[PDB]
């Protein structure tokens, strides 16, 4: 499943990931009430690099399901189609 | 390919390259959809001078791919082949 | 309630929104009291992109209660009806 | 009395703070002497969030008694009205 | 003698101080070596709004004692006199 | 008093306030020393819009107390009583 | 040596300097190669108002020894002379 | 070797080091693969004023070994000829 691509690819999305796609990517996140403001606000604030930030999103990401796996790679997928390119989804 | 040679002389692009080239790859590489209005925003307005633009421009570009410096690197060879010249692209 | 309605359209105020409007905004509400000196300086001046003003105001402005929300919505479309009826509030 | 309006309005303040009101709320506590340096110290720099600063500042000022509670609600109800509305003070 | 009369007009100094005076008065602080270097570029690059950059100033210059705030004091009184008459010294 | 005044009509006085006033208030009040060289050119460089300009110039007045007010009333009153009529001054 | 003398008149310099001196001692600085075209353009973009840029012209020059500080004193001397007998040098 | 020369001038390094040229520096760094994108970013942004960045460039760089403090000071002799006299190299 989604969950799993996600978890076989995590040293990738550590080293890849952008910071505008991180702001995209929390901005949906939010809107779908997945995630709420606590965690956000943690990965916005305690974190001083993109990077850590992204282990951040992942390290919150992947124990909620499939489900947000879902929606965050068909986010990833619809707006910045050349990083999941190269990522192989 | 691409992504390896644009890493290697990244020295050359951030101590060669002026504003007005910028401008133009960041105006082609937004039509071509490598990037999206948040990122180039921020390089736009976060950076005073052109040098740090160019390395933050640098930094958004190389985890995206070959793809996405393929495109960057035809636009600056077909633009300001004096520049392509001298750095020996 | 203005409140919800806010709340639920956050991402099109954060791709949509403009400077001029968040200039005429903000100083909107600091003229009705509902903000004072100390946050409308720091969204102004911590942020450097109009979009994370955008998030600032809109996290600010959340908390405060549907009063707050009210006189944001209708400065809006007293002001800026395209924006108002493309996003249709 | 008035501790007891803050014991039961602990979730209320939490999720609606503000960050400017808590500069704010740290400057009147710092000025009355309730409060001195080394704790507005150590809520400032310990603590990265704004929702874990309001807890710092409620778990602080609810044991030493009823007229720091008193002195807090009536500087967030003097400049800060809409709140105190919203938050039924 | 200076040390409480800055102390007790904390508040006042923190809502109404002016940056360009700031600048001044940080100008005239480090000629007088009573603080160095480090500290002054901490103040002037670690802060974004000038509140902020105020109470650093007044919580880095209370600890040293009696004589810098009889310097600091003389000199907003000697270039800024209209202020030194609002807050009243 | 004169403080009141100017916080009340500070939208006013953004939207219709132009630049040759700008200029002639900066001149008078420098020449009354309630504001000296450095943050009239820090007023005059940085901003590019009258607005922005006007912006700061009560940001700047309003923290200096009542008789800095009282000049700049004096002054608009005297110089361009159409615009004090139409602020109703 | 030229260093102490040059960081004891730091507020002369900030306070009596104008930008044609600034722009002519810079372009003379750079052709003496102590410094490069990283922090002058660092310096020409970043600041807006003169008295900054001599600020940070300063404390660059500073740290850089005195056989720095002896190109821009004698420049200085030869170039305006009426300045340098104003500041005493 | 190198890292005794480094190590017993920390204090000169920390004291009179140019932010410019730890641009530079970094970027040589970069360039010669010792030093990779994780410590350089975490330098970077983690780190307001330039001593402190300083600071953590040399707490990174001496334990690598004898290499890098050649390619760091043959850098610097190379690029900052005045520096590295006035440092004593």
Redesign the interface.
Same mark, same amino acid.
């Given at each position: 499943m989604a969950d799993k691509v996600l978890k076989e690819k995590r040293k990738l999305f550590i !080293?890849?990931?952008? *910071?505008?796609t991180i702001?995209?990517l929390l901005? *949906?996140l =939010?809107?779908t009430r997945v995630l709420n403001? /606590?965690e956000m /606000?943690?990965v916005k !604030? /305690?974190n001083? +690099?993109?990077?850590d930030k992204t282990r951040a999103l992942i390290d919150s990401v992947i124990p909620k399901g499939a489900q947000a796996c879902q929606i965050c790679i068909t986010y990833i997928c619809e /707006?910045?189609?050349? =990083?999941a390119? +190269?990522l192989g989804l």
């Open positions: !080293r890849s990931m952008g *910071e505008g702001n995209g901005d *949906e =939010l809107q403001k /606590e /606000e943690k !604030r /305690e001083a +690099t993109v990077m /707006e910045d189609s050349y =990083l390119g +190269t």
